[PDB]
């Protein structure tokens, strides 16, 4: 079935691979070659997870956990029950995410739109691969990666962080957080602004974008504009993920001590290091 306005856009073309071979839909879903790839990678991944479930011995969604190889294994392969499944599931997951992106690219070409969405999604993929591929490789073992389990992955977040003290002190992490918080602020504001204009007080006519600009100028003395706010939200959300990936790629590689102690470089600068008073003299 189609939305009322949809048929006119369902023309041939846009595919990157396969010509017309996979150029069709299933219900709402576009397929394409990268849709077949996504199905394959995702189905195999899910099957292997369900299998890894049995080798654990359990069917509860909030117990199933697939652990990477132990540190002993370095960057080598591991028997399926002792990390090998995690390694295969990880390749499947990467294959499915990249395939999903590339299928997004095909949909953009068919629709004649910009490639911004899959570009954006690639940042999430890069963050994932930071945690499961890049960071582990730079550190010498698959075992530094997170396990795939609902609760077990939080265990890993918590142990990984407390390895360096309070992880708050990671300065890339501060920047990342700042972006996440700011993005939520901006998303709240933007949503609310558009809706306050489209849904005014009871009598009244729909407000215009000029009213929206006027509201924000009255409030904070500035209006970024309708193009600007979408640029901003994209930048804030991508910046949060970029700095997320940065904050972890540097941790256990370039810096592996207690993150609080990093800040000593500032307090030790020679012009004020030895001055009496304050918290540090």
């Amino acid at each position: 079935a189609l939305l009322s306005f949809e048929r006119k856009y369902r023309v041939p073309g846009g595919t990157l691979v396969g010509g017309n071979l996979f150029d069709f839909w299933v219900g709402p879903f576009y397929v394409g070659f990268f849709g077949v790839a996504t199905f394959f990678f995702a189905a195999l991944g899910i099957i292997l997870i369900a299998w890894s479930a049995v080798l654990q011995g359990t069917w509860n969604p909030q117990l199933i956990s697939v652990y990477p190889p132990a540190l002993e294994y370095g960057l080598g392969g591991a028997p399926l029950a002792k990390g090998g499944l995690w390694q295969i599931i990880t390749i499947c997951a990467t294959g499915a995410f990249v395939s999903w992106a590339l299928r997004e690219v095909e949909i953009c070409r068919k629709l004649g739109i910009g490639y911004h969405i899959p570009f954006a999604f690639a940042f999430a993929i890069l963050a994932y691969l930071t945690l499961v591929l890049f960071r582990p490789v730079m550190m010498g073992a698959w075992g530094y990666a997170f396990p795939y389990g609902i609760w077990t992955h939080l265990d890993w977040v918590s142990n990984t962080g407390y390895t360096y003290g309070n992880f708050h002190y990671n300065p890339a992490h501060m920047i990342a957080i700042s972006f996440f918080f700011t993005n939520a602020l901006a998303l709240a504001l933007h949503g609310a602004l558009v809706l306050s204009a489209a849904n005014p007080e009871k009598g009244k006519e729909m407000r215009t974008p000029d009213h929206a600009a006027t509201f924000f100028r009255d409030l904070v003395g500035y209006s970024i504009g309708t193009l600007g706010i979408h640029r901003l939200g994209l930048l804030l959300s991508l910046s949060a993920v970029f700095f997320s990936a940065l904050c972890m790629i540097i941790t256990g590689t370039i810096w592996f001590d207690q993150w609080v102690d990093w800040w000593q470089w500032w307090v030790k600068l020679p012009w004020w290091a030895n001055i009496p008073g304050g918290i540090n003299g």
């Binding site: 079935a1 949809e6 856009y9 729909m206 309708t226």
Partner: protein, 240 residues
């Protein structure tokens, strides 16, 4: 235990919220249709919401949604297969017929108005006090298509007055008439404006505007549709 009650209550709230939001996002495009325009049997588990009515400014009426959905234009496409879910091939030239990535919607054939009832978009020459404030001024540059042939020259910028942004370049062709090109589909360089989506021979085919100092929402859609469509449909002449 109060925390148990709060979390149980929250999941109930969340489910209702999601139901509400999905129904709010069915105010356009629904009911679903079969490929022949007829109502589809399976609409899914979410019913259409109660209509709402937006009161438009400057006496332009109302919009009530959901309401009866109509393309209000002919659609030059035909099936390529004997069952659902395959593509629909253009029956003539898809750029001229406005299908596929060249599609346009039958928007109102009036200009968008600012908060004061004046036209939102104006050629800069008619917009008092407006000028280029930073960056390369494209006015006067040759315009080059994806075939690396010169299609025309830029004679003005069409600007959004309340936003103070450039929205189109007005390009004059060999015959002396002009076309609008969306600002998002041009590359302003030091000695040219380059247009990837269109070869030089496709510029004349850009839909034209009725009044030479305003553009209607319908006309914007046809212009933007058409230049976007060139990305797929100018396969006879494109290079880097």
């Amino acid at each position: 235990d109060l925390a148990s009650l709060a979390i149980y209550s929250f999941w109930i709230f969340l489910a209702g919220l999601i139901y509400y939001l999905q129904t709010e996002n069915m105010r356009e495009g629904y009911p679903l249709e079969n490929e022949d325009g007829t109502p589809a049997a399976n609409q899914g588990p979410f019913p259409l919401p109660k209509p709402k009515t937006f009161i438009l400014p400057h006496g332009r009426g109302t919009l009530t949604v959901p309401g009866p959905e109509s393309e209000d234009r002919p659609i030059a496409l035909a099936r390529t297969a004997v069952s659902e879910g395959f593509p629909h091939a253009p029956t003539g030239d898809p750029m001229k017929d406005g299908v596929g990535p060249a599609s346009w919607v039958a928007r109102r054939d009036l200009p968008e108005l600012d908060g004061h009832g004046h036209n939102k978009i104006k050629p800069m020459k008619a917009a008092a006090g407006f000028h280029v404030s930073a960056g390369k001024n494209p006015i006067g540059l040759p315009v080059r298509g994806c075939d690396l042939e010169i299609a025309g020259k830029v004679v003005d910028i069409w600007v959004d007055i309340p936003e103070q942004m450039a929205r189109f370049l007005e390009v004059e062709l060999k015959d002396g008439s002009t076309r609008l090109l969306p600002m998002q589909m041009v590359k302003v360089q030091s000695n040219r404006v380059h247009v990837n989506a269109l070869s030089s021979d496709l510029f004349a085919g850009i839909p034209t505007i009725k009044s030479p100092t305003e553009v209607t929402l319908l006309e914007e859609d046809k212009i933007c549709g058409y230049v976007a469509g060139g990305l797929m449909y100018a396969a006879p002449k494109r290079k880097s």
